[PDB]
Amino acid sequence: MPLENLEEEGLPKNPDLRIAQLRFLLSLPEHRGDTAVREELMAAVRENNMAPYYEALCKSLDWQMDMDLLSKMKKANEEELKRLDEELEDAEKNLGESEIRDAMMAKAEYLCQIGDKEGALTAFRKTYDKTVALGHRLDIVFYLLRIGLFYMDNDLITRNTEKAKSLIEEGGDWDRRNRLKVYQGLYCVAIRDFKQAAELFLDTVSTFTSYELMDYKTFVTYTVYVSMIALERPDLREKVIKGAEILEVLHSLPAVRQYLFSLYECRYSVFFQSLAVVEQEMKKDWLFAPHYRYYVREMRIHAYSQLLESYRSLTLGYMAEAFGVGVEFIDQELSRFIAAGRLHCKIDKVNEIVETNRPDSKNWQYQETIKKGDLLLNRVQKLSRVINM
């Protein structure tokens, strides 16, 4: 249930469609009571590009919020505080430790739902100090992480994750360890690298029993989609296809199922057909990419590479048709693909055979040590010049 809030903030960000996404974004925060915070949250939504809030000076006020919702949430939050202060007065009369903690911890989560970060931290703080169930302890720290993922401030995500991360392993709860993977999984799509995310999702479908999560079916549909992006045919084949579990369950997947199947059949005509449509279909509805360039660039390298690895020669017609796009577009794409060194093929258009040399060799692994070393190398010089003054 709360994971959709996090996906929805993500959608105006997609460079593939700014406007439609705004209407997706509004829906779930209106129900939950984010209205009160939303005036402050709105500035983050501008970076993400457009917001349809009542106090928004953004382009789409076509699905603008009514004034009454802002006010209704605000009265509701004060009313909730009024009950709480009073609970607190009662608490001394019973046990100090039990009653004040239960109320303080409940107040924090409520504050977190709204997206008030400041009020959350303080309210939680007392509960941590005091004795409370180990499983409950891991769910409350995840809520502080959950506010930051909504907020889309990157620096903020880091702090919470590191703290939560120590407490999960210390604890006995396996089911809870899984919950953190999903929250972190949202984080992984949020940054440019999509690859990292798939693994968290594969684990979580098995174990993360429903509470703080959507229905089993809507989670499985996310699961297969993300698995396709990271994993090539051997990896995909063993992991998903081999299983007992899918046959027993029965499919409700066919659209996403075709995208997984095409890779295996190694017919890129079927692949590319599924790819133009799927990209638009899945990505817009729920976030797995605020940066559309990364997704297609990685899929296209794999679709070409895999066709080439298995078959030395092809005709231009087959090549044009299977890949989809123009011969002209294809010829530019290749040049970038070659640079990596894993593809290394030549194309004869004047003799109409596209040859693939295909060296599996030490050069491929060698290439990797040399390439990766560059980012780090540049970065220390910069750290050192700062530290010294």
Partner: peptide, 24 residues
């Protein structure tokens, strides 16, 4: 680099259909 994603989705679906007729 350059934004390959906007251009590829539109091109891949459309071009491929003409290519079906043109070549195998």
């Amino acid at each position: 680099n350059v934004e390959d994603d906007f251009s590829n989705q539109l091109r891949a679906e459309l071009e491929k259909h003409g290519y079906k007729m043109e070549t195998s």
